[PDB]
Amino acid sequence: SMQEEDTFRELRIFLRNVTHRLAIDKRFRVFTKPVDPDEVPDYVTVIKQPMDLSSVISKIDLHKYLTVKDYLRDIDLICSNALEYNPDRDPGDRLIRHRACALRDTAYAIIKEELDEDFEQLCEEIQESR
Numbered sequence: 001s002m003q004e005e006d007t008f009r010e011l012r013i014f015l016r017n018v019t020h021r022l023a024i025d026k027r028f029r030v031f032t033k034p035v036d037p038d039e040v041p042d043y044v045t046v047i048k049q050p051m052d053l054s055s056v057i058s059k060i061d062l063h064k065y066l067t068v069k070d071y072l073r074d075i076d077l078i079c080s081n082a083l084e085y086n087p088d089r090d091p092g093d094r095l096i097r098h099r100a101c102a103l104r105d106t107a108y109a110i111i112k113e114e115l116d117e118d119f120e121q122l123c124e125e126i127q128e129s130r
């Protein structure tokens with residue numbers, strides 16, 4: 001219905017605002033664009049499901065997220081991809097891991113403070129109806 005379309009539109013406006021707040025934080029610059037194969041040709045061979053915040057915006061705009069849980073799965077991928085590709089004890093890998101954990105924690109903290117649980121439950125029930 002039109003009222004369900006309006007619910008998904010509100011979801012996309014909420015997700016674009018959360019994503020923009022993460023993307024303008026200087027700690028998370030490395031996560032704003034896909035990894036360039038020039039710099040990192042083994043990336044695409046190790047990480048099978050690359051994800052970054054520009055890809056998340058594109059997904060929102062293609063109507064790929066119908067719940068905040070689905071969006072958070074892609075934020076969790078940005079985090080777990082960085083834990084898997086950069087697992088060493090050296091400071092460059094530790095800094096990327098701590099920035100990726102902090103992205104994930106920040107997205108979950110904004111959602112805890114600003115997502116109404118009844119709005120998420122509504123989205124979940126429309127999704128499940130389809």
Ligand SMILES: C=CCNC(=O)[C@H](CCC(N)=O)NC(C)=O
Pocket residue numbers: 094095097098100101
């Ligand atoms: C799992 C997310 C966070 N990762 C971290 O805590 C990183 C260190 C990496 C480690 N030893 O795991 N932060 C630092 C350097 O303090």
Ligand SMILES: [Cl-]
Pocket residue numbers: none
């Ligand atoms: Cl830096």
